[PDB]
Each structure stands twice: as structure tokens, then as C-alpha cells.
Design an enzyme around this catalytic site. Sequence first.
Site, PDB file in Angstrom:
ATOM      1  N   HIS A  54       0.709  -1.287   0.185  1.00 57.40           N
ATOM      2  CA  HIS A  54      -0.040   0.009  -0.039  1.00 57.40           C
ATOM      3  C   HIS A  54       0.893   1.262  -0.035  1.00 57.40           C
ATOM      4  O   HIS A  54       0.480   2.290  -0.113  1.00 57.40           O
ATOM      5  CB  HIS A  54      -1.169  -0.168   1.258  1.00 57.40           C
ATOM      6  N   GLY A  81       2.680   5.982   9.739  1.00 56.77           N
ATOM      7  CA  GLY A  81       4.110   5.990   9.404  1.00 56.77           C
ATOM      8  C   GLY A  81       4.787   4.808   9.994  1.00 56.77           C
ATOM      9  O   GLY A  81       5.838   4.488   9.477  1.00 56.77           O
ATOM     10  N   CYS A 106       3.883   1.727   9.512  1.00 56.57           N
ATOM     11  CA  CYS A 106       3.506   0.550   8.370  1.00 56.57           C
ATOM     12  C   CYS A 106       5.108   0.069   7.889  1.00 56.57           C
ATOM     13  O   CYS A 106       5.904   0.954   7.605  1.00 56.57           O
ATOM     14  CB  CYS A 106       2.607   0.747   7.395  1.00 56.57           C
TER      15      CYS A 106
HETATM   16  C1  LIG Z   1      -2.886   5.208  10.776  1.00 58.31           C
HETATM   17  C2  LIG Z   1      -2.378   4.161  11.353  1.00 58.31           C
HETATM   18  C3  LIG Z   1      -2.093   3.605  12.492  1.00 58.31           C
HETATM   19  C4  LIG Z   1      -1.653   2.484  12.914  1.00 58.31           C
HETATM   20  N1  LIG Z   1      -1.158   1.521  11.976  1.00 58.31           N
HETATM   21  C5  LIG Z   1      -1.828   1.741  10.653  1.00 58.31           C
HETATM   22  C6  LIG Z   1      -1.963   2.848  10.186  1.00 58.31           C
HETATM   23  N2  LIG Z   1      -2.326   3.053   8.964  1.00 58.31           N
HETATM   24  C7  LIG Z   1      -3.387   2.504   8.149  1.00 58.31           C
HETATM   25  O1  LIG Z   1      -4.116   1.642   8.817  1.00 58.31           O
HETATM   26  C8  LIG Z   1      -3.663   2.939   6.783  1.00 58.31           C
HETATM   27  C9  LIG Z   1      -4.175   2.031   6.039  1.00 58.31           C
HETATM   28  C10 LIG Z   1      -5.611   1.927   5.384  1.00 58.31           C
HETATM   29  C11 LIG Z   1      -6.086   1.030   4.879  1.00 58.31           C
HETATM   30  C12 LIG Z   1      -5.507  -0.187   4.563  1.00 58.31           C
HETATM   31  C13 LIG Z   1      -4.217  -0.266   4.959  1.00 58.31           C
HETATM   32  C14 LIG Z   1      -3.777  -1.558   4.623  1.00 58.31           C
HETATM   33  N3  LIG Z   1      -3.109  -2.362   4.469  1.00 58.31           N
HETATM   34  C15 LIG Z   1      -3.623   0.649   5.889  1.00 58.31           C
END
Ligand SMILES: Cc1ccncc1NC(=O)Cc1cccc(C#N)c1
Lengths: 304, 304
Positions: free
Chosen positions: B41, B143, B145
Amino acid sequence: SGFRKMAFPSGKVEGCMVQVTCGTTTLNGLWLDDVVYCPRHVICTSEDMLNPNYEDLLIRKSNHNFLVQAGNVQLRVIGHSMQNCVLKLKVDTANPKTPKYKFVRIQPGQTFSVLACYNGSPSGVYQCAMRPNFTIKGSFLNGSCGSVGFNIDYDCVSFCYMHHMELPTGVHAGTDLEGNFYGPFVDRQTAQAAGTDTTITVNVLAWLYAAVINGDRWFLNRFTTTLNDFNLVAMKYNYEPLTQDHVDILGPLSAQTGIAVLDMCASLKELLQNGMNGRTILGSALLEDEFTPFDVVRQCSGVT
Amino acid sequence: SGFRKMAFPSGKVEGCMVQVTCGTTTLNGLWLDDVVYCPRHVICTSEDMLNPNYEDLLIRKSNHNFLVQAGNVQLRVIGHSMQNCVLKLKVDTANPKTPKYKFVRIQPGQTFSVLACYNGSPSGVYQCAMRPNFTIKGSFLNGSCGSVGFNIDYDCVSFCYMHHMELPTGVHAGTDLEGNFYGPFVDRQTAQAAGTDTTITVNVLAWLYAAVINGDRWFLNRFTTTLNDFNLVAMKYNYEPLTQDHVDILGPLSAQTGIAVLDMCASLKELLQNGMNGRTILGSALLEDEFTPFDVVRQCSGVT
Ligand SMILES: Cc1ccncc1NC(=O)Cc1cccc(C#N)c1
Ligand SMILES: Cc1ccncc1NC(=O)Cc1cccc(C#N)c1
């Protein structure tokens, strides 16, 4: 989101761990520049530990009696001195992996990461707090002495603790990197009891703020309190007194959540008086006190 | 003595963290040999996340669109491919700090350490468990990921997780290093709900053994039970069923403490039925399930 007991990345400290052997005793040492720091009780036999006279025991030790091994290679000891309860072994080679560092003596309530080591090799990393009775609730076995506690500010490692001893109750005692014990403990095989392990109130409040930031708001009540009223309740529950300095340090968390510090104090007061009622806050059934306000801000902002 | 939620030393994994940028999206990558692994992604805009067709979005991307930075130096991308939900960016330079490693896909209940990173830089390390609903309760912000989960066996790093997503409830979802999501989650900005977060029974029993080894014995009762009787109680409390395989894995802990596995199961049964009564076990007011029997043996023996 999510809130975890997080330790600093241990890489910078792993590059400093060495094994120090003196006679039949093997423990961990910290190699910074051309000096290896280790607990002075490395020169003792189990018999010596009963009532050691370290200056006297050190007279029978020479540079060559201290065996320092870094990885699978032997370091040459060209000098040795005792500073308080630590030995400083000057080696002929500066640690090529020495990070930027400082030696700091922390106050009770302050948190730090511990890299638990055995035979100069790291086994694990965990997050600790210096208790108000100057003990730490670590996880240490025989051979772990010389394992260190530290905090990192971007690229600078502030070493604050070195493991020395396990008290008869299973709690731990150690020194700062100048060899001065935290608390009244001495490096001797004599029964030494710890004082009251009170709760670090400012840390609990910081963790309540972290819980609000993460969606756990059930404990937020319609009440407020004063520092004096709050402290009457805190004294009753063996919680540390809260000062205006603590209120000041909670300011950024109060600003982020819009919850005044005294309002969070009133929520804490009701939690102490009513209990959790089988409920949890951040996956915990008791009030966590090993996160400082700085740790909560750091974890919730993503400081690297 | 002392029992702590301990993570593996993160040094070996810190040496692999890089920053991967594609367009305006910046996340973390794992650099092993001449390949950089990161969530696919990274090629998406927030608009693309609603209903992405990754193969189609990837057609508009070339090697030069993926910016990989390791420390303050830029790595040259000479190839790119998509394996399931991860992107593999072949670089022209092998990571000089690549440790011995394996890619493993863990089962629910298994624990691992997470090195949480932002802009390819490590911020903290914590210990996690793959929940029975295939989610993880991490601590991740935007950030994070590409941050990874791992276990270490002496000098070999077994990578098991890569962070991809935060579900609407604040729990986390990710993949193994082959890009296959744990659980039924998809990398899409669509509401996805997690299943029942049941308690990892075998882990609770392992932690009860750790508590006995450390002096916390108040919960030990005069009763025993059978696997079938125990599981009737466990099902009622949303605890995972205990099998003879789990009993087998608890064997070394049963041998060390002299407490038969079914006797510890009966103690657990009474704890579920009666509650803690305001008491604590290893400083916790609830039953901890993020320590495996292997973790308890490791921590209690000092494996480095
Ligand atoms: C904001 C945040 C906080 C902690 N961990 C992750 C995140 N970010 C997300 O989830 C962004 C996202 C949106 C939809 C799908 C995916 C996938 N694969 C990723
Ligand atoms: C067995 C163990 C476990 C965990 N941490 C430490 C230990 N070891 C000890 O306490 C040995 C000892 C005895 C008396 C005095 C000192 C000092 N200073 C050290």
C-alpha cells in the site's frame, strides 16, 4: 493507537556489552571508549560476599586477573580502578561501537530500558522504573550483574543503572554508572529490606491520559478536586504526593485531551475509592505507574 | 527472580530498517541481502485506499519511483515485484548488516517482538502475541507500516510479521514476510471487524508456572481437574480449548515446579470462577496470556 510498555531499541547498548571474569566469577561489563565498567563484586568469591573489604580484596588483583571478552575476542586490560561500587577496567582498545553517551543518575519514578545480559551476551530488553523505595522490579538471574539501564535521546545513550544485587524479597538494587547505589543498599550478602513501594502518582495520571487518547474513557467522571484533597486520598492509598511540578509536567497531555490535570486527579481519586469493578484500562486491571508523562508524549507522537 | 514482559534485543533488526517512499507515501521497509520488503500500500494515495487494484496501480510505477533510504544514504532500486501484499524492491547493494534470517508464518498464541519504526528509524521495542482472531494489540501510529515482528534463536532472526493496518477498533493487522495477511484482513480502507479475542489458555498456564517459580503461590489450590472439565469452564470464559499438545509443551514447567499440568488447570479454573479478589499475580491484576511456555522457560533459564 494502542499503548504498549515500550523499551528503547537496544542496538546501541548491545554493541557495548562485554563479559568480565575475575577468578571464578563471571558477570557483564559495559565497554565505552577504552573503559569497561562492571560491578566491583566481580572480585569476590561467595565467601567474600558475607563481609567484603573491597579495597583489601582489590590489592590481591592485578590487570591480568580481569578477563574481558567482547564477542569471541579478548581485550587487553592496561589499568584498573574502583569508583564507589563499580570497577573501571582501562583496556588498550576503544570500543569501535561506542555510541554518543552520558552517565545520568535518575530520580525515583523515572523510567528506563534494561538490556538483560548473561556472559556479556544480551538476552532481552524490558522497560523498568526506579521505584520510590530505590529498588527496581526487574527480571534478573545469577550472571545478570553488570546488565544496564538506559534512556536514548535520538542518538545519545544516557546510562542510568547497572544491576548489582537481588534483595531477599526478589526485588533488585543497583548503581548509577559512577558506582553509587540507588537507595541505601550495599554490595554485601547481608539481609537488607526495602522500604514502602508507593505508587508513582504522576505516572498513573500520564497513563490515564494515554488511555483517554486511545479511546478508553469509561473512568472519566463529572468531578474535580484540589491538590490538597487529592493528596489526602493519595496518602491513604500509598500513592506519592502530587506536586505543582507534576501538574506542570502533565500540561501537554492536559492540552492534547482537553482534560484539566485536577479533573484527571478526581477521576483517579474515584478509581482508588471505588476500584475497577472488573473493568480494564489499556488492557490492565490495575493502575500502571511505569510510564512517565514524557514516555506517554513520546509514544503517542512517534519520537525516534 | 522477577518476571517481565521481555522483548528480544532489537539490534539485529535495527540494522535492517530503511525508509521507503513512493510518491507522497512514506513507510518502513526491511532490507535483507539485496531486497527491501515493504507493504504494497506504499504505492497508494489515501483516495486509492478506498478500493485499490494493486496490479493496476503498480503499472504506473517504475524502479525510480521507489525511494529507499538507509540512514542518510540512498539505495538504488534495480527491480520491483509484488508478492501477495508486500513489495520486494531489489536494490544494487546487499545490506552489510544482514543477520542470519528466516521468514516464518506463526500460529495464533505465538509471541514475538516488534521494533516500531517511523521514517525507517526505530522508536521502540515491545513484546506482542498473535491473537486467536489474527489481530495484534500493538502500538502503532501513521508512518509505522512496514515495522516488523520477529523472534531470535541465538544469532538467527525469524521474521514473522510486518505491520500493514489499523482496524476501526484500534487493533492491528499485518502479514508474514511473504505478504500473506494473518487472518481474513485485506489492505483496503473498508470496515473490517475482528472476531472474538479469546484468551490463550496455554500461555496463561505458562505464566502461572512462572509465578510459582518466582514465589507467587497464593492461587495454588488443593484441586485437580480433567482436560474435558477444564475446557467446559474455559469455553464459558472465552478461553481457547486446551489440548494434549498444550499439556505436552507445559511439561518442562510442570517438571521444574513439581505441579502437574491438570493441577495448574484446576487452579486456573478457580481463578476464573472466583476472580482475583483484589490480589495480584506477578504484579498483574488479570491473567496474562502473552508469554508462551517457551518464553517462560527462556526467561527463567537465561537463554541469550
Ligand atoms: C493510521 C495507522 C495507525 C496504525 N497502523 C496503521 C495505520 N495506517 C493505516 O491503517 C492505513 C491503511 C488504511 C487502509 C488499509 C491499510 C492496509 N493494508 C492501511
Ligand atoms: C542471584 C542474583 C539474581 C539477580 N540479580 C542478582 C543476583 N546476584 C546477587 O545478588 C549476588 C550478590 C550478593 C550479595 C551482594 C551483591 C551485590 N552488590 C550481589
